[PDB]
Write an enzyme that holds these catalytic residues in place. Structure first.
Site, PDB file in Angstrom:
ATOM      1  N   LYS A   1       0.848  -1.190   0.000  1.00  0.00           N
ATOM      2  CA  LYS A   1       0.000   0.000   0.000  1.00  0.00           C
ATOM      3  C   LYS A   1       0.880   1.235   0.000  1.00  0.00           C
ATOM      4  O   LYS A   1       1.731   1.402   0.886  1.00  0.00           O
ATOM      5  CB  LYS A   1      -0.935   0.037   1.204  1.00  0.00           C
ATOM      6  CG  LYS A   1      -1.889   1.216   1.143  1.00  0.00           C
ATOM      7  CD  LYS A   1      -3.007   0.932   0.151  1.00  0.00           C
ATOM      8  CE  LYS A   1      -4.046   0.018   0.799  1.00  0.00           C
ATOM      9  NZ  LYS A   1      -5.215  -0.265  -0.076  1.00  0.00           N
TER      10      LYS A   1
ATOM     11  N   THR B   1      -3.072  -5.352   0.949  1.00  0.00           N
ATOM     12  CA  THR B   1      -2.564  -3.984   1.037  1.00  0.00           C
ATOM     13  C   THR B   1      -3.383  -3.165   2.033  1.00  0.00           C
ATOM     14  O   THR B   1      -2.840  -2.310   2.751  1.00  0.00           O
ATOM     15  CB  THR B   1      -2.569  -3.326  -0.352  1.00  0.00           C
ATOM     16  OG1 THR B   1      -3.915  -3.055  -0.761  1.00  0.00           O
ATOM     17  CG2 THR B   1      -1.925  -4.255  -1.391  1.00  0.00           C
TER      18      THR B   1
ATOM     19  N   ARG C   1      28.896  33.503 -12.114  1.00  0.00           N
ATOM     20  CA  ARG C   1      27.568  33.110 -12.573  1.00  0.00           C
ATOM     21  C   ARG C   1      26.763  32.676 -11.359  1.00  0.00           C
ATOM     22  O   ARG C   1      27.311  32.485 -10.273  1.00  0.00           O
ATOM     23  CB  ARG C   1      27.632  31.974 -13.608  1.00  0.00           C
ATOM     24  CG  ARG C   1      27.970  30.617 -12.973  1.00  0.00           C
ATOM     25  CD  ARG C   1      27.902  29.434 -13.933  1.00  0.00           C
ATOM     26  NE  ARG C   1      28.259  28.206 -13.223  1.00  0.00           N
ATOM     27  CZ  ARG C   1      28.183  26.980 -13.728  1.00  0.00           C
ATOM     28  NH1 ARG C   1      27.771  26.797 -14.975  1.00  0.00           N
ATOM     29  NH2 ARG C   1      28.520  25.932 -12.973  1.00  0.00           N
TER      30      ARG C   1
ATOM     31  N   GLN D   1      29.851  19.553 -10.031  1.00  0.00           N
ATOM     32  CA  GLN D   1      30.477  18.310  -9.581  1.00  0.00           C
ATOM     33  C   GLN D   1      31.317  18.534  -8.325  1.00  0.00           C
ATOM     34  O   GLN D   1      31.234  17.759  -7.365  1.00  0.00           O
ATOM     35  CB  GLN D   1      31.364  17.741 -10.696  1.00  0.00           C
ATOM     36  CG  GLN D   1      30.686  17.117 -11.914  1.00  0.00           C
ATOM     37  CD  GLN D   1      30.196  18.130 -12.932  1.00  0.00           C
ATOM     38  OE1 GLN D   1      30.360  19.339 -12.752  1.00  0.00           O
ATOM     39  NE2 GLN D   1      29.703  17.636 -14.067  1.00  0.00           N
TER      40      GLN D   1
ATOM     41  N   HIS E   1      19.079  26.757 -14.461  1.00  0.00           N
ATOM     42  CA  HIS E   1      19.821  27.814 -15.127  1.00  0.00           C
ATOM     43  C   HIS E   1      19.164  29.174 -14.918  1.00  0.00           C
ATOM     44  O   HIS E   1      17.947  29.323 -15.049  1.00  0.00           O
ATOM     45  CB  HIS E   1      19.957  27.493 -16.611  1.00  0.00           C
ATOM     46  CG  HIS E   1      20.719  26.228 -16.870  1.00  0.00           C
ATOM     47  ND1 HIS E   1      22.079  26.129 -16.676  1.00  0.00           N
ATOM     48  CD2 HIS E   1      20.313  25.011 -17.307  1.00  0.00           C
ATOM     49  CE1 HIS E   1      22.479  24.902 -16.968  1.00  0.00           C
ATOM     50  NE2 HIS E   1      21.425  24.205 -17.356  1.00  0.00           N
TER      51      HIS E   1
END
Lengths: 292, 292, 292, 292
Positions: D12, D57, D170, D213, D241
Site C-alpha cells: 500500500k 494492502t 555566474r 560536480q 539555469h
C-alpha cells in the site's frame, strides 16, 4: 577520513525537441523530452573542479538539436545515435544513459499540418551504453484502464489488523506503467511498441482477475510469448480504489453502481515477467526510475 | 471601525464520483469531479459561529452520491438536480454554484466492461442559481493543438523594447480552454458539447492565422453562428512557443524543422465572443475560474 | 447571425525574473513570476488579423527585464511602473492587468551571497488599470496552517442525507489563500504584507473555532480593523480533513491522536470581509483567479 | 515459450498519517506519507490467482495506523517496527521495502496547538529488509538553494557543438536531493538528519564552485567526515539555469543583475560519495527511486 567518488553521471535533462517532417505537404510531428547523461572518468571534475573532461551539458543539448536536423526513424534510434556519438567521440567517456519521453499527436480530421495532442499515454525509451554493450528499455506510462466487473479478491489471510471484506465483484482500475528490455537493437521499435500496447490492453481486459498480481502476470506473459526480442517486462500497477458507497442511511441500495474514486492511499503491485533462463539483474534497471 | 460580511459561498469541493450503468451486460461509465457550494443567509455562521444555517459540507457530499444512485442523463442535468434540491430545500439558501469535471472513457476493443481513459480533453460544467434565475456554462479544457505551418505574425509596432522578427511561417500551438453560456436549459447537452468541440477544432485547423486573436475570434464565431442556444463563449489560449533553433553555429540550416518547445513564459490571449444584443456581463463569469 | 467581440485581454504570462542587488558585498535577491496583459482597442486584431495595435507579447517580456535593470523597491511598485508604461505609451491601450508572484529566499547562515528558498508561502500582487484608476490587490497563498484542538462543529441542521457526527474537539487545517484590495496606491507594501500575514496567523491560531466560517471572519476582521488603506479582504480556505481513525477493530482507543489526512473531497469555505459602506463589486475581482 | 516470475513486491502506497502527541498542553505533530511493500514467495498469487500468501494492502495500511497509536520516536524507528512486524509475522514474507516522507510543522508564535507547514524541505526514509539483513537510507529533498556569485565554469573541451562561453562569475542554483545509507540503526536519526542538512547547506554555501560536480563532492565529503555511522551519500543536483539577459538591444548593460530563470532543460549532476573501503554497491539503491 578517506573519501572516494563512487557511481556518478551527468548531463542535460528534459531537452524539449519537436521535429517537423515537411518534405511533402503532409507534415509529421515527432515530439520528445530527451535526457543525456555521460559516464566515465570524471574524477578530477569532482575532486579538483578540473573541467577538462566535462563535456558541457549545454553542448549535450546542442548535440540533441543538431542531430535532430538529420531526422530519425524512431525515438530509440535517435537515442542510439546520441549515445554512440558521445561514447566514441571522447576517450574518457565510457558509457552513459540517454532517455526520452515521446508525446503522441493525432491529426485534426486528417489535416496535413493541424494536430491535437493524444494525452492518453506517453511512450518512453531508455538507452544505457556500457563499453560495447547497448541496452534499450522501451515503455508506456500514464495509460489508465478500468474494468467495471470481472475482478475478485478473496482467500487472503487474515491477522488481527485485517478488516478487508472479500468480494467476487469489484472495479479494477490502474495506470499501466510498463517497461520491457530488448535483447537486441535490431528491432522495428514502432511496430513492437504498438504490438506490446495491444497485448497489455488485451490481457488486462480479458483476464478474469482474481488478483491484480494475476492480471499483471498475464499481461507480461502475453508480451514475452509473442516477442523473442524482449527478455523481460516490468510493470508497476497502482490499484486505484473505487469504494462502493454506503447509501443505506439515505434509504437507498447500491448494486455496484455508485463509487467513490479515492486518491490516496492506493495499492502498488509491481512485478517482473521474464523469459525462463534470461538475465536476472540487468544493470539498466538500477537507474531506470532515477539515480536517487 | 465597522466590518461587514460580503460575498460568500461554501460547500464541498472535488467529490470524485463514478457511476456505472450495468442494467445490461454492456456497461456505461460516468466519471465526474463535483463541487457544490451554497449561497444565502450565512451571516451568523461567520459573525457568531451559529451553524443553524450551515448545511454540512459532508451532507452536500452525501447528497451527490445519493442522487447519483438514480442515474443522470448528462452532467448538466445532474448539476441542475443538485442546485434545485439545495435552493428549494432550505429557506435561507437563495442560490449557489455547482460545478463538475467530466472525464471520458473509451472501450478497450469494444469490450462490454473494459475501458481506458481518454485524457486528451476534460469536459466542464458550471451551474449558478440566483433566486429564480439559473445559468449554465459548459466548457472544454486541456485540449492541446498545434499547427506546424499556416501561421504568421507581422505588422506589429516596433518600440524601444521590440526585438521580435516578423515571420510568415511559424508553429502555432495552444491549450484550448473554452467556456460557453447557454441561454436556456432546454439543450441536448451532450450533442452540443460534441458539436462545439468539433467546431473549435475545425476553426483552429482551417483558419490561416495572422494572429492568435484572429484564430480565437473565428473559433468563437463558428460556435455562435451554429448554436442559437449559446449567447457567448470565452476562450483563454496560451501561445506555447516553439522556437526555431539556430543551427548555423554547427554548419546547418533549419528549414522550419527543428524546434525548442519552451515552458515559460508564454503568450496568453483571452477573449469573449458574443451574440449581438445579448447580455454584456453575466454574473456567472465573476467566479467561473474561482472565488479569489 | 451577428457576432461581436466582447471583453478581451492579451499579453505574456509567467515571465520568470530574478533581480540581484550587488551594489555591496551583501547581495539581495528579488524573485518574481510576472504576467503582463493589455486591454484597449484590439478589435481589428481579432476580426481581421491586423496587428497594428498588437504590442507583441515578446515586447512585453523584454520590457519586464529592461525595467528590472533599474531596480524596484517592491513588487507592487514594479507592476505600477509596467502598467503606467503600457497605458501611457500606446494610445489604443486603455488599461490592463499585471500580476506577480514573489518567492522568498532566506540566507544560508547569514551569508552575503548564498540563499535557500522559503517555500512556506508565496506572495501575490495584482494591478488593474482602467483609465485613470489603478487598483492593487495584494495577497498570500500556499500558507498551510493547522490547529490540533480548539475547533468545534455542532448545531448544524440535519436532513435525511446528514450523517456527520457533531464534535467539540477536532483538527482544523487549511491552506490560507487571501487577497486584500487597497483603496490607495500610497502604501508601504512590504510592511503591510508583513502585518496582514501576522494578523491572519494570529486570528487563525487564537480564535476558538465553532466553524471555519467564524475563523475566517475573525481573520478578515483583524485585517480590516487594523488597516485603513484596505477596503476588503477575500479568503478561500479549504477544510483539509483529518479523519480520526477507527482503531476499535484492532482493540485500541484513539484519543484524538491518529488521523488520516484525506486529499479529496475537502470543504471549501469562501468569504469577503469589507469595511462597512465600501464598494460591493470592484471589477478587479472578476478576473482575479483567471479569465475563464 | 517458458515464462517466469522475476523480482516483485507489492503493498500500500502513500498512507497519509498525522500523529498528534497531546498527553500534555504542548502538542506535537508528526506528519508522514508512508509506503509499505512486501517481498517473498508470491508465485502462486501471480501464476494462479491464489491469494493465500497475499497479506492485503488494506491490512498493511491498517497496521500503519494501529502502530502509530503507540507513538514513535522517529520516522526511521517507525519504519523499522513495521518491517520487523511483517518479516517476522509471515513465514513466506522474506523482506520488503518501507518508505516515508516526513513533512515539517512550525508553531505559530510558539502556540501550544497551532502550527504552520514548513514547506522548504521534505525528509525521506527508506528501509529494506532482506532475510536477516536490513538497511536504512535517510534523505532530504526539495531544498532549493542559490549562490548569486562564487561560481565559475571554464576549461571545458570545445567540440563542433560547443557554443557555451566560459565564465568566472555566474549564479549556481539547485534543488538538494540527498540520500545517505547508515551502517547501523543504533543512532539518533533526528539529530543526524539536522546535522547532515546543516553540513550540506554549509558546504554548498562556502565552496568556491568551479563545477557543480566539485560542490557536490565537497557536500558529500563534509557529511562523510563527521558521521561514522554513514557509509555513503548519493546526490542528484539539477543545475537550474539563471540566464544573464541581453539588455544591449535596449541600450542597457547587465552587470550580473537581471536573470531569466528557465524551467527546462537543466543540468543534472549526480554522484555518490563513499567512505574508503565501504561497500561499493548496496542493493537498496536499485529500487530507491522506484521499481520501474
Amino acid at each position: 577520513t578517506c573519501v572516494v567518488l563512487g557511481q556518478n553521471q551527468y548531463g542535460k535533462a528534459e531537452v524539449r525537441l519537436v521535429k517537423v517532417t515537411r518534405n511533402t505537404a503532409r507534415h509529421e510531428i515527432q515530439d520528445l523530452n530527451v535526457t543525456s547523461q555521460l559516464r566515465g572518468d570524471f574524477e578530477a571534475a569532482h575532486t579538483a573542479g578540473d573541467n577538462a573532461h566535462v563535456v558541457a551539458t549545454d553542448t549535450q543539448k546542442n548535440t540533441v538539436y543538431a542531430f535532430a536536423r538529420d531526422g530519425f526513424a524512431t525515438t530509440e534510434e535517435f537515442l542510439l545515435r546520441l549515445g554512440k556519438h558521445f561514447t566514441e567521440g571522447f576517450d574518457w567517456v565510457t558509457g552513459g544513459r540517454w532517455a526520452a519521453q515521446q508525446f503522441f499527436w493525432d491529426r485534426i480530421n486528417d489535416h496535413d499540418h493541424a494536430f491535437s495532442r493524444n494525452k492518453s499515454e506517453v511512450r518512453t525509451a531508455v538507452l544505457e551504453i556500457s563499453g560495447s554493450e547497448q541496452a534499450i528499455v522501451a515503455g508506456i506510462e500514464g495509460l489508465t484502464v478500468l474494468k467495471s466487473t470481472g475482478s475478485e479478491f478473496h482467500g487472503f489471510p487474515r491477522d488481527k489488523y485485517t478488516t478487508l471484506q472479500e468480494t467476487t465483484d469489484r472495479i479494477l482500475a490502474t495506470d499501466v506503467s510498463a517497461r520491457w528490455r530488448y535483447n537486441t537493437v535490431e528491432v522495428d521499435f514502432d511496430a513492437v511498441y504498438a504490438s506490446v500496447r495491444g497485448l497489455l490492453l488485451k490481457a488486462f481486459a480479458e483476464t478474469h482477475s482474481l488478483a491484480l498480481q494475476q492480471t499483471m502476470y498475464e499481461m507480461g506473459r502475453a508480451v514475452i510469448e509473442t516477442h523473442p526480442e524482449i527478455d523481460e517486462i516490468k510493470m508497476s500497477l497502482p490499484n486505484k480504489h473505487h469504494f462502493l458507497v454506503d447509501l443505506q442511511p439515505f434509504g437507498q441500495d447500491n448494486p455496484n453502481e455508485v463509487f467513490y474514486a479515492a486518491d490516496r492511499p492506493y495499492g502498488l503491485i509491481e512485478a517482473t515477467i521474464q523469459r525462463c533462463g534470461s538475465r536476472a539483474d540487468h544493470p539498466i534497471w538500477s537507474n531506470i526510475a532515477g539515480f536517487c
